[PDB]
Structure 1
């Protein structure tokens, strides 16, 4: 029988907080927006906002806040924020009450936004007492934090545009207020099909969670209301950092002399459960979070539900270009799940916090390409694209490699997305090697794949092939077995080809 895991013992892999650099003082800079009072930051205390009082920017470089005095609506032109306040400061006893409240400041979508799934959740899925608690406690508490937005998020939030290398660090409390607003669909300029300014950003308002008959919707709502119940009953005290990273220069893959690093590979366990303290790869959509606020539940998006603070990145994160990723440090897990997705129960996150009061949970969104024609991914241009995407996700400029955790990852962009698991494993191993990080690879039930990955890594390591030598083998595979292949896949597979090439010298 196959073993459960192979390679380096997982406990010998580096992880946070132990491996981490000494953090300098948290402070704003040209590359770092910090929305809280750093001098008053104290463990277990809700951070205070900086500035003390709301300051507004309504322009193309910052989030358009719903509480802006430039957020106008027909009443003459009147305050949409005052209308939002009046709409939401009402008693809800039936789901149509919530629908009508939300539509008061979204009149243009009165017909276009269906609320069938919300109605069904409220009346059919919840028991009478659960529904009562929803509308007597949770929803009014959600309204309170949402309408406190100008007192909570006092500092303009910059848009993380393409090509920006920039960080935003905000409190979990600030994020809660932002997400309560997203639930009540209050963010202006984020709704229209013909959107101009925000066409290159993901949806943020939660309207599409309320629509349709999908049996998935009630499980999404359960998971989000678990979060909203938690943060309203006990205000979170941590910080979260969102960093856009955009690299212009990449390794010279054909000549790279860096050695392969360590590997732990296993067909049991999960990235979030067993990669604690490690850099956790989110198998992302280029629109980060993908369809999380609307339809379907695909590769990675479950993470955005169980760590819902990740969702707020959609407010300010432009669609990722090929050379870009988003790194999120400090999100908390609020829910556990089974499966077929179903909310199981709440989660009490036990992670330690770093010196900036950020939970030791680092997630990187990197989007694989889709391969609608299988052989496309072996073309050198496409191998390099994926290498560079992974490398951007793994690299930490100016951080010594000894202070970097192992990368916790798995079958990135494979299955129905068209990626070949064995190629993608080797691509991630090479990118990790170039960024000088070890790899913890979860195959999620596939024990033969675990063995095949371990066997290849062992062979390449023992024969002392560096990144460049392995890349050259991938080029040979393309040129000799793929370029002229007239069938969907070649007769000789990649790993067998690599073994024979090296063994024949």
Structure 2
């Protein structure tokens, strides 16, 4: 029988907090928006907002806040005043919640279906659970939502394409923002022919309430677990959201960097067994994918069990080819079983992760989007090999951080299966990108033991024969030119790994 794991023992890999740099003092800069008082930041205490009182920016460089005095509705009145009046009502039946949300979303009264919300409230939840939802949870959520201007006093910049910028806010600030997202209060984020925000993911939660899918009740359970936790016991930590956009990449053909360590296994999970490691989110270029709609695979699941990730959709413009989003400090509030149609909320999770010197949990997640390959051979074209190498490299590289202070990358089959990526090519691409960024690799194959063995065997071969990144890249070019370029069938007769073995064994 196959071994459960191969390569370097996982305990020898680097992880946070042990491997981490000594952090300088947290402070605002041109590259770093910080929305809390760093001088009074203390372990186990809710951070204070900075500035002390609300400041509004209503412009194309910042989030358009629901509490803005420029948020107007039909003479021209205050939409925030209307939101307060709508939400400060007793909820006893799901229609009451629908009617509240639609008071300040009149244009969508016909377009937004609330069937899933109604079924969740009336049929899925037991009577006692329903009562708790409308008697405590929903009112408590309204309270933190309407406190937005007192909690989020600082304008939140949009993380636009090409920006290298970080935003660090408190988990409490995120809770208030996400409660607003639940009640669908964010202006200009709803229209299908919207202009300014057409390049941003959805933030308002309206699509969680629609339709008859059995998935919706599980999403609502997972999110209500979160909202219950944060309203009963306010979170005290911070979270950093960092957009990274690289213009320059390794000259892959000539790269002399050696391959790094590999641990590869067909058991375990990125979030469970990659604790303290750089955890890859197999992203959509709109970060979070269909979390607030119909999607429920790797990304969306992560965005539901660590829901502070969802707030990134408020201010993160769609990723370009050379970009990623890095999120440090999100907390796990839920446990789940299954996947996609079998996904179920299992129970609450009590996150026991340590926090760094900026009070961020030692959980780092990077959203990198693979290309979708609707024609299989396209991914072996050198330009597309380089696109994926560069995307992964952007996700892994940390400018100005010594290699010894970098955790292993915890990843797996990125953009494979129905997205069209070849697992064996994609594994080698990530290994090369990690090598270029001088990080080790922990690779989860999710039940595919043959794939685990093949990845380990290839890494071992390449490592023992001392082929550096450039040598392996040149072998990929050889495969393209010799077996793919002139291939009249959907796939070549000889596979990549066999081709590499024979290429090297027939060489000098």
Shift of 1:299: 3.3
Shift of 1:298: 2.5
- Aligned partners of 2:260 and 2:470: how far apart in 1? 14
- Deviation per residue, 1:440-474 (Å, 9 max, x gap): 00000000000000000000000000000000000
- Aligned partners of 2:434 and 2:112: how far apart in 1? 44
Shift of 1:176: 0.1
Q: Give TM-score scaled by structure 2 length.
A: 0.99
In the other structure, the counterpart of 1:47 is: 47
Shift of 1:107: 0.3
- Aligned partners of 1:260 and 1:127: how far apart in 2? 55
- Deviation per residue, 1:325-380 (Å, 9 max, x gap): 00000000000000110000000000000000000000000000000000000000
- Aligned partners of 1:280 and 1:296: how far apart in 2? 20
- Deviation per residue, 1:189-238 (Å, 9 max, x gap): 00001100000000000000000000100000000000000000000000
- Aligned partners of 2:374 and 2:190: how far apart in 1? 30
- Aligned partners of 1:369 and 1:154: how far apart in 2? 38
- Aligned partners of 1:52 and 1:299: how far apart in 2? 39
In the other structure, the counterpart of 1:278 is: 277
Whether the aligned pair in 1 keeps the contact of 2:416 and 2:422 (CA below 8 Å) is yes
- Aligned partners of 1:104 and 1:318: how far apart in 2? 28
In the other structure, the counterpart of 1:66 is: 66
- List aligned pairs for 1:65-464, cutoff 5 A: 65-74=65-74, 76-339=75-338, 340-464=342-466
Shift of 1:301: 1.3
- Aligned partners of 1:300 and 1:38: how far apart in 2? 32
- Deviation per residue, 1:390-441 (Å, 9 max, x gap): 0000000000000000000000000000000000000000000000000000
- Deviation per residue, 1:73-128 (Å, 9 max, x gap): 01x11110000000000100000000000000000000010000000000010011
- Deviation per residue, 1:154-173 (Å, 9 max, x gap): 00000000000000000000
- Deviation per residue, 1:271-329 (Å, 9 max, x gap): 00000000000000000001000112123210000000000000000000000000000
- Aligned partners of 2:348 and 2:292: how far apart in 1? 20
- Aligned partners of 1:464 and 1:344: how far apart in 2? 46
Between 296-305 and 373-382, report the one with greater CA deviation: 296-305
- Aligned partners of 1:296 and 1:180: how far apart in 2? 21
- Aligned partners of 2:136 and 2:299: how far apart in 1? 31
- Aligned partners of 2:504 and 2:290: how far apart in 1? 44
Partner SS state of residue 253, structure 2: coil
Structure 1 runs not aligned, ≥5 long: none
- Aligned partners of 1:375 and 1:354: how far apart in 2? 44
- Aligned partners of 2:242 and 2:193: how far apart in 1? 29
Partner SS state of residue 57, structure 2: coil
- Aligned partners of 1:460 and 1:300: how far apart in 2? 31
- Deviation per residue, 1:137-157 (Å, 9 max, x gap): 000000000000000000000
Partner SS state of residue 330, structure 2: coil
Partner SS state of residue 426, structure 2: helix
Between 289-298 and 360-369, report the one with greater CA deviation: 289-298
- Aligned partners of 1:387 and 1:379: how far apart in 2? 12
Partner SS state of residue 254, structure 1: helix
Whether the aligned pair in 1 keeps the contact of 2:289 and 2:295 (CA below 8 Å) is no
Partner SS state of residue 241, structure 2: strand
Partner SS state of residue 176, structure 1: helix
Partner SS state of residue 387, structure 2: helix
Partner SS state of residue 325, structure 2: strand
- Aligned partners of 1:84 and 1:333: how far apart in 2? 30
